[PDB]
Amino acid sequence: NWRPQLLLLLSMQDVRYLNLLNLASQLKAGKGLTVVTAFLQGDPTSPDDKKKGEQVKARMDFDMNQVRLRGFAKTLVHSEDQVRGSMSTLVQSVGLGGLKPNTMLISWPVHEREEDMTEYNTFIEKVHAASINDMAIVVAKGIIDFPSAVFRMSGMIDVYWIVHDGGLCLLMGYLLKQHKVWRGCKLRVIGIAQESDNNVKMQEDLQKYVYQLRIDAKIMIVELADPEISKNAFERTLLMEERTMMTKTKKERMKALDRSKVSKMHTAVRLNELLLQHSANSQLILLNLPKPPVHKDQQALDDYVHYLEVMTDKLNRVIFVRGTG
Amino acid sequence: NWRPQLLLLLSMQDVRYLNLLNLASQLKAGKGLTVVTAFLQGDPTSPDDKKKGEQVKARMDFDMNQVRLRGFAKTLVHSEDQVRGSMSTLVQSVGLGGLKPNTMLISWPVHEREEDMTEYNTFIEKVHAASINDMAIVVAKGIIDFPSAVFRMSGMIDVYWIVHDGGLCLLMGYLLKQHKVWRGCKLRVIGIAQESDNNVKMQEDLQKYVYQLRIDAKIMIVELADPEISKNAFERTLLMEERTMMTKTKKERMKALDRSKVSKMHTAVRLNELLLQHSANSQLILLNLPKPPVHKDQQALDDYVHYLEVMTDKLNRVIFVRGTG
């Protein structure tokens, strides 16, 4: 009976903003209390930037009211080279006064021009900040944009349950299904079977699970080692590896790290082929968000983001979800 | 009938910490709700630094309990190069959950070894952060240390009322006078008369003021242009200026800026002579905190701090106070 209490993080300078408000409102369906915080780059000691920030806050309060999202907004002014500590401090200090959000909601980072680099470069920090402060995190990904309360969807919502998460992905999909925007859809729960798993038992146990929770969902089990999917993904990967192509203890440590990199890339591509085969036309896909790298290198962030962009390439809407423990 | 609701800021690594708790407790006398935040330098994405931070928080909760200061504590982990944005963000975001501190309490910054430079270099930022977020600020200065509830003081508390502050300095002194530690003292309100002020009228009007507020305070008016004080300060300044000694529009702009620097230094020294003449043996001195520089240069901070250190040199305990407007 746990439900998300949301904390939205945004960077200010329009589409991703209103999309995020719409998703937040549909998750909450008028209940709860949501905190929306916008980060505005400027001088935190300047009165002119302060009232600029309170104009933004007023505009955000109006918007929340329009999408019928119950809560309040807050603007935070930071200087450019301090966005990192300002964000992580907000997460540690939110609800010093009483409320405590248990769920962070953010947008997938953009990284096409130089303006976006502050939001791209803090992505891993935000993911770590959530789990370290006992919050789930939700990451919305999509250039195909998100419906408002004016629309009625009725296609597929696919929950891929491929990690032990206590059913967190499933809860998010079930919660959307309760809102009128998504109520018409068909919920599907897709398990991915490894070579040693028992597909029939996975199907039966998932069916008994949703039956006992009285959830109207279809159950499907797909094979990660599918011959066709594996051949296709391998051939695709080799072509990708050629584009971006344009003593003993530390030796073998180097080989092992490269091995795992190549292996992780082949896996991402195989997952993408599987998602395209089964959910190319799905209106919503919910996935676990994998553990981010422990290291702060720029290559580590670039690799993490690329892994996930490759994995979810050419899909419509993806929501990544990650809990705490 | 306004009263301060405190927010203490500390940097962690012992004496200044407990001194600050004692002053906070004496201002509040068991009432209100106080937030104590400690800044711990580390990795905000590291679990090991997180539970380190919660040990500190537990130790602080115990200490507040001992000095009978009602409220709670919070530890914030930041990296070293992000202390600036982490502090200013805490001030903007404290009481997102309900409570709203209206008064920041900090310690005068230390700047003797390289460990202190993070706290010294954020001093002006903290002063601006308070006023921009509609908070008064209180700055405790003293190497001669502060009494705990075990002691009874009975010397002089001198409120220098030399700026239009709505009586904020006086309120702070009156509040201490209500606590048993300071109740035995004699409160003195000292006005400083410029050459064109009318000393007799200043005295009469201050006496009628405290009479109508039913405050037991003595009233004294001193002359800033005192011949002896002015001669002494001038001779002292010339000696100081020799130690640290070891087209037309921008020309005159340069001369004017140097003029005001030399003039500000002579004034600081004159004020210090006046405070030593009248309050050398006072147990507590309360002063307005002057507007900090608008510029972020390192020389601007160095000059601001030096001005105030020169002004309050060789005194026992000084509390600077600054409101909002």
Q: Note whether A128 contacts B35, CB cutoff 8 Å.
A: no
CA pair distance B103, B124, nearest whole angstrom: 16
Distance from CA of A296 to the nearest CA of B (A): 10
B128: closest chain A residue by CA = A45
Nearest to A95 among B35, B44, B96 (CB): B96
Q: Note whether B86 contacts A82, CB cutoff 8 Å.
A: yes
Q: Note whether B79 contacts A97, CB cutoff 8 Å.
A: no
Phi and psi based region of residue B214 (left: phi greater than 0; alpha: psi -120 to 50; beta: remaining): left
B220 within 8 A of B189, measured Cβ to Cβ: yes
Interior CA angle at B279 toward B140 and B183, to 5°? 65
Which pairing describes strands A318-322 and B71-78: parallel, antiparallel, or unpaired? unpaired
Give Cβ neighbours of residue B71 (< 8 Å, ≥ 6 apart): B6, B32, B33, B34, B35, B36, B64
For residue B182, the one-letter residue type is: W
A222 within 8 A of A189, measured Cβ to Cβ: no
Question: How far does chain A reach from its first CA to its final CA, in angstroms?
Answer: 18
Q: Note whether B89 contacts A92, CB cutoff 8 Å.
A: no
Q: How many Å is the maximal CA-CA distance in chain B?
A: 65
Phi and psi based region of residue B305 (left: phi greater than 0; alpha: psi -120 to 50; beta: remaining): alpha
Give the CA-trace dihedral at A104, A107, A110, A114, to 10 degrees.
-50
| Closest to A305 in 3D by CA, of A163, A106, A123 | A123
Is it true that domain B156-322 has CATH number 3.40.50?
yes
| Closest to B129 in 3D by CA, of B146, B152, B106 | B106
Distance from CA of B284 to the nearest CA of A (A): 31
CB contacts, 8 Å: B94 with chain A: 93, 96-97
A51: closest chain B residue by CA = B132
Cα–Cα distance list, A239 to A275, A302, A314, B229, B262 (Å)? 20, 20, 17, 86, 72
Both tokens of A301, joined, read: 């962030």
Cα A285 to its chain centre, rounded Å, is 10
Is it true that domain B6-141 has CATH number 3.40.50.1820?
no
A49 within 8 A of A43, measured Cβ to Cβ: yes
Chain A residues touching chain B at CB-CB below 8 Å: 35, 37, 44-47, 50, 74, 76-79, 81-86, 88-90, 92-100, 125, 128-129, 132
Give the CA-trace dihedral at B117, B118, B121, B122, to 10 degrees.
-150
Both tokens of A206, joined, read: 């998932």
Residue bearing tokens 């209106």: A283
Enclosing H/E stretch for A276:
helix A248-279
A117 within 8 A of A36, measured Cβ to Cβ: no
CA pair distance B90, B83, nearest whole angstrom: 11
The pair phi, psi for residue B299, each rounded to 5°, is -65, -35
| Closest to A121 in 3D by CA, of A131, A132, A110, A129 | A110
Q: Note whether B93 contacts A94, CB cutoff 8 Å.
A: yes
CA pair distance B53, B75, nearest whole angstrom: 6
The pair phi, psi for residue A298, each rounded to 5°, is -70, -35
Phi and psi based region of residue A214 (left: phi greater than 0; alpha: psi -120 to 50; beta: remaining): left
Distance from CA of B60 to the nearest CA of A (A): 16
Q: Note whether B96 contacts A92, CB cutoff 8 Å.
A: no
Dihedral of CA B237/B242/B246/B252: which sign?
positive
Residue bearing tokens 């789930």: A136
Distance from CA of A128 to the nearest CA of B (A): 6
Burial (CB count <10 Å: 0-12, 13-18, 19+), residue A260: exposed
DSSP string, A190-228: EEEE-TTS-HHHHHHHHHHHHHHTT--EEEEEEETT-HH
Give the CA-trace dihedral at B248, B253, B258, B262, to 10 degrees.
110
Give Cβ neighbours of residue A241 (< 8 Å, ≥ 6 apart): A262, A265
**Secondary structure class of B65 (helix, strand, coil):** helix
Domain ranges, ordered by start, for chain A: 6-141, 156-315
CB contacts, 8 Å: B44 with chain A: 85, 88-89, 92, 125, 128-129, 132
Distance from CA of B126 to the nearest CA of A (A): 9
- Identical fold at B6-141 and B156-322? yes
CB contacts, 8 Å: A99 with chain B: 96-98
Taking only Cα atoms into account, the Rg of chain B, rounded to an integer number of angstroms, comes to: 21
CB contacts, 8 Å: B96 with chain A: 35, 74, 93-97, 99
CA pair distance A258, A266, nearest whole angstrom: 12
Distance from CA of A138 to the nearest CA of B (A): 18
Mutate which: B7, B81, B86, B296, vs A, most A CBs within 10 A: B86
Both tokens of B277, joined, read: 């003449």
Give Cβ neighbours of residue A201 (< 8 Å, ≥ 6 apart): none
C-beta neighbour count of B54 within 10 angstroms: 10
Report the 3 state secondary structure along A232-251: HHHHHHHHHHHHCCCCHHHH
CB contacts, 8 Å: A100 with chain B: 97
CA pair distance A44, A52, nearest whole angstrom: 11
B130: closest chain A residue by CA = A45
Nearest to B128 among A45, A81, A99 (CB): A45
Q: Note whether A96 contacts B35, CB cutoff 8 Å.
A: yes
Q: Note whether A128 contacts B45, CB cutoff 8 Å.
A: yes
Q: How many Å is the maximal CA-CA distance in chain A?
A: 65
Give Cβ neighbours of residue B62 (< 8 Å, ≥ 6 apart): none
Q: Note whether B96 contacts A100, CB cutoff 8 Å.
A: no
B90 within 8 A of A87, measured Cβ to Cβ: no
Q: Note whether B74 contacts A94, CB cutoff 8 Å.
A: no
CA pair distance B278, B228, nearest whole angstrom: 13
Cα–Cα distance list, A266 to A199, A289, A291 (Å)? 23, 18, 18
Mutate which: B93, B121, B294, B297, vs A, most A CBs within 10 A: B93
Nearest to A89 among B35, B86, B98 (CB): B86
Q: Note whether B89 contacts A90, CB cutoff 8 Å.
A: yes
Nearest to B82 among A85, A95, A98 (CB): A85
Residue bearing tokens 């789990």: A131
Residue bearing tokens 């002057």: B290
CB contacts, 8 Å: B35 with chain A: 96
CA pair distance B223, B194, nearest whole angstrom: 7
**Secondary structure class of A35 (helix, strand, coil):** strand
In eight-state DSSP terms, residue A29 is T
Q: Note whether A99 contacts B95, CB cutoff 8 Å.
A: no
CA pair distance A140, B85, nearest whole angstrom: 27
| Closest to A39 in 3D by CA, of A84, A70, A4, A101 | A84
Which pairing describes strands B217-223 and B71-78: parallel, antiparallel, or unpaired? unpaired
B89: closest chain A residue by CA = A86
Cα–Cα distance list, A226 to A9, A280, A288 (Å)? 39, 17, 22
Distance from CA of A144 to the nearest CA of B (A): 32
CB contacts, 8 Å: A125 with chain B: 44-45
